Amino acid sequence: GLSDGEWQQVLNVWGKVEADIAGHGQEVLIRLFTGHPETLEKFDKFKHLKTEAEMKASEDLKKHGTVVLTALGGILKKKGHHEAELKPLAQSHATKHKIPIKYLEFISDAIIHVLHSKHPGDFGADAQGAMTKALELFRNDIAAKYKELGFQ
């Protein structure tokens, strides 16, 4: 649960992402894969990437970063009223992709890391607080659907 002022911070931060969605999405995925190599094994279409240079050169990885961040941005713009947008993603990630909730924690922290890396000194303490709370709400509502499905 976020206040109006917190949602305003989230959507202000998101404007930074929307100016270069593919570059942000690329770096989020590279941070996830290099920090947590077990996550790469969930992607049949990326498991061939062995080095970070290959990851950086991959146009399909940048494409997938755009897909991921476009979906997240659509959810965030709902300011918590995201049941319809979140349900299919929870269902596909539990039943088809088999993504443990831990990996959604990993990607949440990776988003925070990338924002500081690309906007150093321009991602203030209030903005980090609000973004973190928004990613926690997203993860928590996915977790409720995972529990319904019995997925661990």
Q: Within 17-76, which residues bind ligand HEM (CB under 6 A)?
A: 39, 42-45, 67-68, 71-72
With CB under 6 A as the contact rule, which of the stretches 3-11, 98-106, 112-120, 126-134 interacts with ligand HEM?
Answer: 98-106
| Interface with ligand HEM, residue 149, by CB under 6 A | no
Binding residues for O2: 64
The answer to whether 26 and 61 are in contact (CB under 8 A) is yes
Cβ atoms within 10 Å of 18's Cβ, excluding its own: 12
Q: Which of 99, 114, 115, 127 binds ligand HEM (CB under 6 A)?
A: 99
Q: In terms of CB distance, is 56 or 97 closer to ligand HEM?
A: 97
Interatomic CA distance for residues 87 and 72, integer angstroms: 13
Instruction: Name the strand (E) or helix (H) holding 82.
Output: none
Interatomic CA distance for residues 16 and 61, integer angstroms: 20
| Interface with ligand HEM, residue 110, by CB under 6 A | no
